[PDB]
Every structure is written in structure tokens, then in C-alpha cells.
């Protein structure tokens, strides 16, 4: 007996099932505590039930609270559960409804309706006691098993007692620092059995290696605090406004795995950040000094895919691999052979959200993972950088009753995970999608954010697959986080910044599970989202399409690569269309910003469309826009440029193209986002998805001797289809930059950041300011192809119609020239003004940009090939 689950128990007194009018006259609910039911032979009824009860059809249908919470079942027929039913008892049983047509029940609705709980969860410490609280309303029994030590035998089991769906027990203070697991007896739909499950605590704050046991630690214990921890708020980098944010996206292992200036034993993890004089930390300091404000760290909570036990780690022979040819498939074969047992994974495989990853700690048992995480945050803050966590609330690594990697779904099966209309777990996020639409999932997400903000003094959060998270969850979290104060909680919540990837697809599209955290839905929330429009317009095509499809900054029309993309008029128009999209992005990607489009017609950002016919500009404020051309996913900036541009371009030319891309981000309105390595030409040898490609393909070289281009074809699983285009490029010596190119890229990246932070005009705080002050000057059907001219006005003259934002400059004009030749852009509207080359560029180590000039009589800005030139009018 293994029924599916097409019916829903939505409230205490209502069941929803999508059956006909006649079938609805003979529906009954059946329960068995021992899960002993079966179909009778004859198939004319259900057998082996403890109880059977008729469900009368509810003529009215489902009420508004239900259909609002579960829109996708809004047309289902409703069935009344009689008051005689003991609902608390039945939800602990195997349940079916039947009329022959038999099916199980999806219980989250009723579980929330009856057992939504706002009291203490996890471990609570008092002077004389420790208490444990676990929400498990469908469980038949819960005990706790204590171990002395991470590896020793069970010393004691203690029974918990349930009240209102929550199991609790109180013990003596000596329980502190024991290890434990819950023994949970609960009905698992996937096995149609009541099973004894050994599960960690969803509210865990520490763990033994691999989360095998939960450490009963008091997170407020003084010995877990680095020196001066409680004074960190006072030491944190000032942040006057979210409009001043720039973001640098970095993986913890990539940072220090190859860094010879860090002690061998401390490479790859949290402790590497404590080495202030390391090549890695000096690099971050250099960026921080230039203006960089935030470092976004890839997943650093307890995730699966890396063993916490370091003695199990495997490594390639780097000497041997370095001997292989640049376009060989031997390197990736060697990497792939041990990729399941190496120290490496991006970490998008969540197990327990509230605990630091053990593999990044010096010792995965005991306190090191806590103290060292704090030491990392403190160290970054002390070189002027705020810390953002990549949070992955949208899915779980594992589900079901078995395995070290399943926790949430062991305890309350079928509740923390989202399911389809047959009861099967939804997998669009990767696998085991969460259901933040359910009350205790929403609670756990918000509680977890608060844990990181308060216990670890984390400064911001990037939400992975934010479109899989309910908007209500996002906003409840935002308000909870930003109301934290130093007096009450030791952190200034007003400065905590939230952003995410609001992709809208699969089961959450069209608000089918509720209003989800999509790009369009988060407009007006003040929560940032990644602008994929500017990314794709600059680079060309998209990460799923033909890799050779060119864009504004990879030679579309201007420098064709030989891949057929239409006639000359078609490519010229496509280039101009991408330029429109970029300019909307450069002005904060706003709904209402008015641009003269490539046809000459004035259009709002929302009126310029993507291929799906959706607005390019979709935000209400520049702080809702995260502008980027690169991130951990897909090809690195250096790699996408190396693929899309004409093969005959020199590496020197490509280096200028890299700078153009990062400069478009760095001088944009909204919040610029950089992938770690943009600034040093980082390559993964064209790996399109390097999550499991090891240290070999993900190398971050802070000696600057290499950029990791030409270290073999990348791993076959994600890349083999494109090996034919990769091989000749990786093999060509002219594609590979030397140290000189890498250092040059870094110097110009530093300079463009200095420029951003030299004027408040690049960082306007509201849409009104952008609409009033930002103008583009190379527009319409006769625009000069390959040039964007962006002017930003400040108060000038006597009694001006705007506030003076800039004490040094009354006007800024930025010319982005992607043409492989000098251009002269005449802007007679800006004639007879006091424009000069920005002082940073006058003193640039790049000789080419110094040649940029302005002619007053004509308003002519002369800009060399493949250059971004910034002109200022001094006060
Ligand atoms: O074999 C069992 C196996 O089990 C374990 O492994 C589990 C899984 O591991 C691997 O999965 C991992 C991925 O490989 C990793 O890349 C990583 O993926 C996550 C990313 O890091 C996250 O950032 C995020 O990314 C999702 C998605 O976002 C982006 O795509 C956007 C795009 O940018 C937008 O423009 C837009 O595009 C659309 C466009 O707008 C439309 O017009 C139209 O064209 O359609 C476009 C979309 O089609 O929207 C898209 C999104 O729709 C980004 O560009 C893209 O690259 C990215 O994919 O979330 C990612 C998913 O989690 O982490 C994964 C999990 O670790 C394997 O690949 C899986 O198969 C495997 O199951 C265990 O570890 C193993 O040991 C074990 O063997
Ligand atoms: Ca791996
Ligand atoms: Cl070869």
C-alpha cells in the first residue's frame, strides 16, 4: 500500500480534493496509527483502518484564506471534517481519503492552522537548566539521545513531552556541551510506514563532523567570542547609505587554497582571513581602500558535498597536471576522478542553515567553527569590508527518513519541502524545494537570518533563488533584521542589506504558490535583485544559448566573430537594442526612467522589453538593482570575452574589453557587483559550471603570475558539448595573459572604484534624482554604434533647481567606447563648459586613457578605442 497524495488537509475542518460532483457524495477519511491500511481484495473499500468518517461536501467551496495561501488548489472541491474528529490524533497517522479512488493527504495547511508556534525552539539555557524544544506535530514520539563526545556511545535517552505540537524536555545545566540527536517516530509518506528517525536539531548552532550529532552549545558563552567581539559594532566600516554599496563575490576555499603566504594548516577555511599580511588579505585591503564595501561569501553554513573529516580528502598531483597540454582533457579526468572526495564544493546543498560549515574550521568537533567564523567577520570588518552571506533557503540537499544529510524532512515529513499536486517533492531548485509559504518554514528562515545577524554580526544577505521564496517571507525578514539595534542586540540592523536572485520559473511562476520573490514582485521593496538584462546585453546572448552570440562589449556588428547573426543592418540594430537595455541598467534599471530608444521613440524602462515581453527596467529605486556582468555561475568575465570576441584579437585588446565591462558596472547607478577575479583576469579555462571542478579549475592566484587560462579542457559533464570551441582557444598561446596584464587589470580596476567613490553623482539615492540628473547623449537611429555617453548633472549657477550633492564637481560625463578606434562625440548641449579629464585618469598607469580630451567650442569628447573616459567639471 503506497498511495500518492492528491488531497489536502487545509484547515482543521476542511479537506480539498479535485473530484467530480457525483464522486463527492461518497468521500470518507480513514486513519491508521500503525500505518496498517490496504485496499480490500475486490477493491470496493479500504481495509485495516482504526477509524473511518464520512466527509460531507462543503457546497461553498474553499474559503478566501485557503485560496490565498494555496492558489494552485483554489478550484478544488471542499469537504467538511466533522467536529467529532480528533485532528491532533489523526495527523500522527497514516491517512487516506477514498471514494475506486484512493489517495493520501497533504497536511501543511492543517498543521499551520492548528500548530503554528511562536514560542522557543531549539536549546534554551538558564542559570540552572537547559531545555530542548522541537516542533513535530505529526510525530508519535520524540526522545533525545545524549552522547559524551562526538564519537562515543549513547549515554542516556530522555523522553520529550508534547504540548501544542511542540516536544520539550528540561534538564540540568550539566547538559551543556553534550552531543545529541532526536529519536523521532513519525509516519513517512515515501515509505508508507511509521519510522524511527535519528535527526539533528533544525535550530542547531553547532555540530560534530558532518552534522552527525548536534553540539548542545550555549552560543552566548564568553569563550566563543574573539577578543573585543562585543565592541565590533563600533569598529564596523561606516555605511551612510545602501547607495554606497559595492559587492565582491568570493568563495572561502578559492580565497586561500593556493595562497602560499598562509600557513599550510590554515589554507582553505575561515582561519585564512585572520592572516592580515597574507597576499589574499592584502589584495582585499587594496580593493577596500579603493572603495569596495562588501564581500559576499559563497555558502558557509552546514552543506553537503564536502567531508568535514580532512583525513578523507583527496588531491590531484598538481605537478603532473601542470605538464599536460593546455587543451588536453587529462586534467579534468584527474579532477573528476576525485571530485566527490576532494575539499571542494560551492556549497549550494543545504543541510542545517544555522551552523558554520565544519570543513572550513580547523577542527569540526567543538567550538572552532564558531570562533573562527567570528574571527573571519571581525578580520574583514577591520580591513574596511562588510560581510554578506549567500543564503540558500530555497531547497534542501536531501529528504526522507534516512541519511546523515536529511534533517528537516526526517522530523516533519512533507512539510518543509514543497510538493506537486500528486504529493511528489518539487525539484526545480536542484532538488527538495522548500515551502517558505508554510508558517514554520517561514519562521525558520527568519530565525536563521537573525541568528547570523546577531550571533555572527553578519552585515547582509544574498538570497539564492529568491523567486522560490515567498515575498511575505522576504519582507518579514527585512523588517525583523533592520529593526535590530546595538543597544538590544549588539548590531545596527538599519545597515543590514538584502538582495537576491529573483528568477521566476517552474512551479512558482505566475504567483501559483503565492506572491513569490521574483524580480517584478520585489519592485518597490528596497530589496536588491540581479539585473540579468544588463549582463546579457554587455556580454551577448545568454548563458544557455549559443556561446558565440555577441553583445555590446564582445563585438556585435563592430567586430563580427564569424558566427552568423544576421545581415549588417540586423546586427547594427541588435547592437543598438542592447545599448538601450544597458543604458536603462546604467540609470538604475528603473521602471519609469525615460530613454530616447534606438528608434528615436522615447520609452520608459518598463516599455523596453526582453524577449519574453517583460520589462527591462523593473525597479522603483536604484538600491533594488544589482548590476553585474559576471558571478560564480557560468563563464568568468575573462572567459566569456575570450569566447565571444574575434579569435584574432590580441590578449592586450581583450584586457581592455574586460576593463570596459567592469567599469560599466563600477560607474552605474544602483549597486555594482563584481565576481572575485574580474579585477585580475580570472579564468576557469572556460568552465561553464565550476561548482565541483576542484581547486584546479577555480584557482585564485594572488601572486598574479597566472590567471588559470589554459589548464586543460574543463570537466566533461557540464562542458563537453562546447569543447570544440574551447580547445583551439585554450591551446593558443596568444590568449593567455602574463603577470603584466594581470597587474594592469588590477590597477585600472582600483582606479575605476576610486572614480565611483570620488563623486556622489555616481551613487544617486532615489529614482527622482536619477530621472532629474542622468542623461544619455548618443541615442536614436543615427547613434554612433559602439558608444554610450552618460551625463550626470549637479547643482550649478545661482539658485539652481536641485540640491548640490558634490562639493568638487558640478557635472560628470562618462563615455564608454567599445569601438576598436578613437571616437569623437559632439554634444553641443555640453559645449562651453569646464570639462577636464578626471584626475585619476590624468594620472593613470594606462597611457591610452590619458589621451582623452574635451573641446569647449563644440562640446566634443575625444575618446580612444576600447576605453572608458570620465570627464568632470570642477567647482
Ligand atoms: O547526482 C546526485 C548528486 O546530488 C548532489 O548534487 C546535487 C546537484 O548538484 C549540481 O547542481 C549544482 C549546480 O551545478 C551548481 O551550478 C549550483 O547551482 C546553483 C547556483 O550556484 C545558484 O546561483 C542558483 O543558480 C540558478 C541559475 O541561475 C541563473 O540562471 C538564470 C539566468 O541568469 C536568468 O537570466 C534567467 O534566464 C532565463 C531567461 O530570462 C529567459 O528569457 C529564458 O531564456 O530562460 C532562461 C532560463 O532558462 O533565469 C535563469 C534561471 O531560470 C544562472 O545563470 C544559472 O547558471 C543558474 O543555474 O541555483 C543553482 C541551482 O542550485 O549548485 C547546484 C547544487 O549544488 C548538479 O548540476 C545537479 O544535477 C545535482 O543534482 C551531490 O552533491 C552529488 O555528489 C550527487 O552526485
Ligand atoms: Ca567536490
Ligand atoms: Cl592535446
mmCIF file of N, CA, C and O in Angstrom, residues 355-417:
data_model
loop_
_atom_site.group_PDB
_atom_site.id
_atom_site.type_symbol
_atom_site.label_atom_id
_atom_site.label_comp_id
_atom_site.label_asym_id
_atom_site.label_seq_id
_atom_site.Cartn_x
_atom_site.Cartn_y
_atom_site.Cartn_z
ATOM 1 N N UNK A 355 24.481 26.712 11.310
ATOM 2 C CA UNK A 355 25.785 26.287 11.804
ATOM 3 C C UNK A 355 26.838 26.542 10.732
ATOM 4 O O UNK A 355 26.602 26.224 9.564
ATOM 5 N N UNK A 356 28.010 27.079 11.114
ATOM 6 C CA UNK A 356 29.117 27.167 10.157
ATOM 7 C C UNK A 356 29.575 25.810 9.603
ATOM 8 O O UNK A 356 29.573 24.810 10.328
ATOM 9 N N UNK A 357 29.988 25.792 8.336
ATOM 10 C CA UNK A 357 30.491 24.577 7.683
ATOM 11 C C UNK A 357 31.757 24.058 8.364
ATOM 12 O O UNK A 357 32.747 24.785 8.481
ATOM 13 N N UNK A 358 31.723 22.797 8.794
ATOM 14 C CA UNK A 358 32.835 22.200 9.540
ATOM 15 C C UNK A 358 34.132 22.073 8.760
ATOM 16 O O UNK A 358 35.215 22.195 9.336
ATOM 17 N N UNK A 359 34.028 21.847 7.452
ATOM 18 C CA UNK A 359 35.214 21.673 6.604
ATOM 19 C C UNK A 359 36.074 22.944 6.524
ATOM 20 O O UNK A 359 37.272 22.859 6.238
ATOM 21 N N UNK A 360 35.462 24.102 6.792
ATOM 22 C CA UNK A 360 36.152 25.392 6.789
ATOM 23 C C UNK A 360 36.736 25.765 8.158
ATOM 24 O O UNK A 360 37.387 26.803 8.291
ATOM 25 N N UNK A 361 36.499 24.919 9.163
ATOM 26 C CA UNK A 361 37.044 25.105 10.513
ATOM 27 C C UNK A 361 38.313 24.286 10.683
ATOM 28 O O UNK A 361 38.531 23.307 9.964
ATOM 29 N N UNK A 362 39.152 24.677 11.639
ATOM 30 C CA UNK A 362 40.361 23.909 11.929
ATOM 31 C C UNK A 362 40.036 22.536 12.511
ATOM 32 O O UNK A 362 40.763 21.568 12.267
ATOM 33 N N UNK A 363 38.962 22.461 13.295
ATOM 34 C CA UNK A 363 38.529 21.206 13.928
ATOM 35 C C UNK A 363 37.003 21.159 13.889
ATOM 36 O O UNK A 363 36.350 22.007 14.498
ATOM 37 N N UNK A 364 36.423 20.180 13.167
ATOM 38 C CA UNK A 364 34.968 20.173 13.020
ATOM 39 C C UNK A 364 34.191 19.751 14.282
ATOM 40 O O UNK A 364 32.957 19.871 14.308
ATOM 41 N N UNK A 365 34.894 19.258 15.302
ATOM 42 C CA UNK A 365 34.290 18.975 16.600
ATOM 43 C C UNK A 365 34.636 20.093 17.585
ATOM 44 O O UNK A 365 35.760 20.575 17.613
ATOM 45 N N UNK A 366 33.667 20.489 18.395
ATOM 46 C CA UNK A 366 33.884 21.529 19.389
ATOM 47 C C UNK A 366 33.709 22.926 18.828
ATOM 48 O O UNK A 366 33.021 23.104 17.819
ATOM 49 N N UNK A 367 34.332 23.931 19.477
ATOM 50 C CA UNK A 367 33.999 25.339 19.245
ATOM 51 C C UNK A 367 34.656 26.046 18.057
ATOM 52 O O UNK A 367 34.234 27.159 17.725
ATOM 53 N N UNK A 368 35.656 25.443 17.418
ATOM 54 C CA UNK A 368 36.453 26.180 16.432
ATOM 55 C C UNK A 368 35.621 26.770 15.293
ATOM 56 O O UNK A 368 35.898 27.885 14.856
ATOM 57 N N UNK A 369 34.603 26.046 14.827
ATOM 58 C CA UNK A 369 33.781 26.554 13.720
ATOM 59 C C UNK A 369 33.035 27.838 14.090
ATOM 60 O O UNK A 369 32.805 28.683 13.231
ATOM 61 N N UNK A 370 32.675 27.987 15.364
ATOM 62 C CA UNK A 370 32.010 29.202 15.833
ATOM 63 C C UNK A 370 33.002 30.362 15.956
ATOM 64 O O UNK A 370 32.798 31.409 15.345
ATOM 65 N N UNK A 371 34.079 30.178 16.723
ATOM 66 C CA UNK A 371 35.035 31.260 17.000
ATOM 67 C C UNK A 371 35.718 31.724 15.717
ATOM 68 O O UNK A 371 35.930 32.918 15.499
ATOM 69 N N UNK A 372 36.068 30.768 14.861
ATOM 70 C CA UNK A 372 36.790 31.094 13.631
ATOM 71 C C UNK A 372 35.911 31.822 12.608
ATOM 72 O O UNK A 372 36.399 32.674 11.863
ATOM 73 N N UNK A 373 34.618 31.510 12.579
ATOM 74 C CA UNK A 373 33.691 32.262 11.736
ATOM 75 C C UNK A 373 33.637 33.717 12.200
ATOM 76 O O UNK A 373 33.687 34.645 11.393
ATOM 77 N N UNK A 374 33.533 33.900 13.513
ATOM 78 C CA UNK A 374 33.511 35.237 14.102
ATOM 79 C C UNK A 374 34.812 35.978 13.829
ATOM 80 O O UNK A 374 34.795 37.159 13.488
ATOM 81 N N UNK A 375 35.935 35.276 13.950
ATOM 82 C CA UNK A 375 37.244 35.871 13.655
ATOM 83 C C UNK A 375 37.346 36.335 12.202
ATOM 84 O O UNK A 375 37.957 37.370 11.920
ATOM 85 N N UNK A 376 36.699 35.598 11.299
ATOM 86 C CA UNK A 376 36.653 35.953 9.879
ATOM 87 C C UNK A 376 35.867 37.245 9.653
ATOM 88 O O UNK A 376 36.328 38.138 8.935
ATOM 89 N N UNK A 377 34.687 37.336 10.259
ATOM 90 C CA UNK A 377 33.845 38.520 10.118
ATOM 91 C C UNK A 377 34.579 39.736 10.689
ATOM 92 O O UNK A 377 34.629 40.791 10.063
ATOM 93 N N UNK A 378 35.166 39.561 11.868
ATOM 94 C CA UNK A 378 35.916 40.615 12.534
ATOM 95 C C UNK A 378 37.093 41.092 11.680
ATOM 96 O O UNK A 378 37.307 42.294 11.529
ATOM 97 N N UNK A 379 37.843 40.147 11.124
ATOM 98 C CA UNK A 379 39.008 40.469 10.291
ATOM 99 C C UNK A 379 38.623 41.269 9.052
ATOM 100 O O UNK A 379 39.277 42.259 8.712
ATOM 101 N N UNK A 380 37.560 40.842 8.371
ATOM 102 C CA UNK A 380 37.095 41.549 7.184
ATOM 103 C C UNK A 380 36.633 42.959 7.543
ATOM 104 O O UNK A 380 37.042 43.927 6.895
ATOM 105 N N UNK A 381 35.827 43.078 8.596
ATOM 106 C CA UNK A 381 35.399 44.389 9.097
ATOM 107 C C UNK A 381 36.604 45.293 9.393
ATOM 108 O O UNK A 381 36.566 46.488 9.103
ATOM 109 N N UNK A 382 37.670 44.715 9.952
ATOM 110 C CA UNK A 382 38.841 45.504 10.356
ATOM 111 C C UNK A 382 39.704 46.001 9.190
ATOM 112 O O UNK A 382 40.475 46.932 9.372
ATOM 113 N N UNK A 383 39.571 45.400 8.007
ATOM 114 C CA UNK A 383 40.155 45.980 6.780
ATOM 115 C C UNK A 383 39.116 46.741 5.933
ATOM 116 O O UNK A 383 39.326 46.970 4.735
ATOM 117 N N UNK A 384 38.003 47.124 6.561
ATOM 118 C CA UNK A 384 37.011 48.009 5.957
ATOM 119 C C UNK A 384 35.929 47.360 5.113
ATOM 120 O O UNK A 384 35.259 48.050 4.348
ATOM 121 N N UNK A 385 35.748 46.045 5.255
ATOM 122 C CA UNK A 385 34.757 45.313 4.463
ATOM 123 C C UNK A 385 33.640 44.726 5.313
ATOM 124 O O UNK A 385 33.893 44.054 6.316
ATOM 125 N N UNK A 386 32.406 44.988 4.898
ATOM 126 C CA UNK A 386 31.235 44.340 5.481
ATOM 127 C C UNK A 386 31.025 42.971 4.824
ATOM 128 O O UNK A 386 31.456 42.743 3.696
ATOM 129 N N UNK A 387 30.382 42.061 5.545
ATOM 130 C CA UNK A 387 30.316 40.649 5.149
ATOM 131 C C UNK A 387 28.890 40.248 4.808
ATOM 132 O O UNK A 387 27.979 40.429 5.620
ATOM 133 N N UNK A 388 28.712 39.707 3.607
ATOM 134 C CA UNK A 388 27.421 39.225 3.151
ATOM 135 C C UNK A 388 27.484 37.702 3.078
ATOM 136 O O UNK A 388 28.465 37.144 2.580
ATOM 137 N N UNK A 389 26.442 37.036 3.575
ATOM 138 C CA UNK A 389 26.298 35.592 3.422
ATOM 139 C C UNK A 389 25.383 35.239 2.263
ATOM 140 O O UNK A 389 24.317 35.833 2.091
ATOM 141 N N UNK A 390 25.811 34.249 1.483
ATOM 142 C CA UNK A 390 24.972 33.627 0.464
ATOM 143 C C UNK A 390 24.058 32.617 1.151
ATOM 144 O O UNK A 390 24.510 31.554 1.565
ATOM 145 N N UNK A 391 22.775 32.945 1.257
ATOM 146 C CA UNK A 391 21.831 32.094 1.974
ATOM 147 C C UNK A 391 20.984 31.315 0.978
ATOM 148 O O UNK A 391 20.566 31.853 -0.058
ATOM 149 N N UNK A 392 20.764 30.039 1.290
ATOM 150 C CA UNK A 392 20.158 29.092 0.344
ATOM 151 C C UNK A 392 18.933 28.460 1.017
ATOM 152 O O UNK A 392 18.966 27.310 1.462
ATOM 153 N N UNK A 393 17.853 29.234 1.103
ATOM 154 C CA UNK A 393 16.653 28.815 1.834
ATOM 155 C C UNK A 393 15.629 28.109 0.937
ATOM 156 O O UNK A 393 14.575 27.694 1.405
ATOM 157 N N UNK A 394 15.962 27.975 -0.343
ATOM 158 C CA UNK A 394 15.028 27.528 -1.384
ATOM 159 C C UNK A 394 14.971 26.021 -1.594
ATOM 160 O O UNK A 394 14.094 25.525 -2.310
ATOM 161 N N UNK A 395 15.922 25.294 -1.023
ATOM 162 C CA UNK A 395 15.951 23.848 -1.194
ATOM 163 C C UNK A 395 16.863 23.169 -0.198
ATOM 164 O O UNK A 395 17.689 23.828 0.447
ATOM 165 N N UNK A 396 16.691 21.852 -0.086
ATOM 166 C CA UNK A 396 17.493 21.007 0.801
ATOM 167 C C UNK A 396 18.273 19.971 0.011
ATOM 168 O O UNK A 396 17.810 19.468 -1.015
ATOM 169 N N UNK A 397 19.447 19.626 0.523
ATOM 170 C CA UNK A 397 20.286 18.618 -0.109
ATOM 171 C C UNK A 397 19.549 17.301 -0.207
ATOM 172 O O UNK A 397 19.595 16.636 -1.240
ATOM 173 N N UNK A 398 18.852 16.944 0.867
ATOM 174 C CA UNK A 398 18.249 15.625 0.996
ATOM 175 C C UNK A 398 16.889 15.690 1.667
ATOM 176 O O UNK A 398 16.553 16.667 2.336
ATOM 177 N N UNK A 399 16.102 14.645 1.460
ATOM 178 C CA UNK A 399 14.822 14.492 2.133
ATOM 179 C C UNK A 399 14.660 13.038 2.569
ATOM 180 O O UNK A 399 15.521 12.200 2.303
ATOM 181 N N UNK A 400 13.561 12.753 3.255
ATOM 182 C CA UNK A 400 13.226 11.394 3.646
ATOM 183 C C UNK A 400 13.768 11.005 5.005
ATOM 184 O O UNK A 400 14.452 11.791 5.663
ATOM 185 N N UNK A 401 13.470 9.768 5.431
ATOM 186 C CA UNK A 401 13.724 9.294 6.785
ATOM 187 C C UNK A 401 15.158 8.845 7.065
ATOM 188 O O UNK A 401 15.509 8.641 8.233
ATOM 189 N N UNK A 402 15.968 8.696 6.020
ATOM 190 C CA UNK A 402 17.291 8.081 6.144
ATOM 191 C C UNK A 402 18.420 8.997 5.673
ATOM 192 O O UNK A 402 18.231 9.842 4.801
ATOM 193 N N UNK A 403 19.601 8.812 6.253
ATOM 194 C CA UNK A 403 20.804 9.509 5.791
ATOM 195 C C UNK A 403 21.210 10.669 6.677
ATOM 196 O O UNK A 403 20.366 11.371 7.251
ATOM 197 N N UNK A 404 22.518 10.873 6.777
ATOM 198 C CA UNK A 404 23.089 11.957 7.576
ATOM 199 C C UNK A 404 22.711 13.347 7.047
ATOM 200 O O UNK A 404 22.706 14.313 7.807
ATOM 201 N N UNK A 405 22.385 13.440 5.759
ATOM 202 C CA UNK A 405 22.161 14.743 5.108
ATOM 203 C C UNK A 405 20.713 15.235 5.140
ATOM 204 O O UNK A 405 20.445 16.385 4.793
ATOM 205 N N UNK A 406 19.783 14.373 5.546
ATOM 206 C CA UNK A 406 18.390 14.774 5.701
ATOM 207 C C UNK A 406 18.114 15.098 7.170
ATOM 208 O O UNK A 406 18.317 14.250 8.038
ATOM 209 N N UNK A 407 17.665 16.322 7.454
ATOM 210 C CA UNK A 407 17.264 16.689 8.816
ATOM 211 C C UNK A 407 15.807 17.147 8.884
ATOM 212 O O UNK A 407 14.976 16.504 9.544
ATOM 213 N N UNK A 408 15.488 18.252 8.217
ATOM 214 C CA UNK A 408 14.141 18.839 8.322
ATOM 215 C C UNK A 408 13.036 17.857 7.932
ATOM 216 O O UNK A 408 12.034 17.718 8.640
ATOM 217 N N UNK A 409 13.230 17.168 6.816
ATOM 218 C CA UNK A 409 12.224 16.246 6.298
ATOM 219 C C UNK A 409 12.159 14.910 7.050
ATOM 220 O O UNK A 409 11.173 14.195 6.928
ATOM 221 N N UNK A 410 13.196 14.560 7.806
ATOM 222 C CA UNK A 410 13.117 13.412 8.725
ATOM 223 C C UNK A 410 12.075 13.634 9.802
ATOM 224 O O UNK A 410 11.355 12.706 10.190
ATOM 225 N N UNK A 411 12.014 14.871 10.290
ATOM 226 C CA UNK A 411 11.283 15.201 11.506
ATOM 227 C C UNK A 411 9.809 15.474 11.248
ATOM 228 O O UNK A 411 8.951 14.936 11.953
ATOM 229 N N UNK A 412 9.528 16.334 10.273
ATOM 230 C CA UNK A 412 8.153 16.628 9.851
ATOM 231 C C UNK A 412 8.052 16.351 8.350
ATOM 232 O O UNK A 412 8.075 17.273 7.534
ATOM 233 N N UNK A 413 7.972 15.065 7.972
ATOM 234 C CA UNK A 413 7.977 14.743 6.551
ATOM 235 C C UNK A 413 6.877 15.442 5.746
ATOM 236 O O UNK A 413 5.735 15.537 6.202
ATOM 237 N N UNK A 414 7.245 15.940 4.567
ATOM 238 C CA UNK A 414 6.293 16.520 3.627
ATOM 239 C C UNK A 414 5.822 17.924 3.968
ATOM 240 O O UNK A 414 4.836 18.390 3.410
ATOM 241 N N UNK A 415 6.538 18.607 4.861
ATOM 242 C CA UNK A 415 6.119 19.936 5.336
ATOM 243 C C UNK A 415 7.117 21.040 4.995
ATOM 244 O O UNK A 415 6.720 22.105 4.538
ATOM 245 N N UNK A 416 8.402 20.813 5.265
ATOM 246 C CA UNK A 416 9.427 21.817 4.966
ATOM 247 C C UNK A 416 9.707 21.862 3.464
ATOM 248 O O UNK A 416 10.248 22.847 2.956
ATOM 249 N N UNK A 417 9.317 20.793 2.763
ATOM 250 C CA UNK A 417 9.538 20.668 1.327
ATOM 251 C C UNK A 417 8.235 20.937 0.578
ATOM 252 O O UNK A 417 7.158 20.578 1.050
#
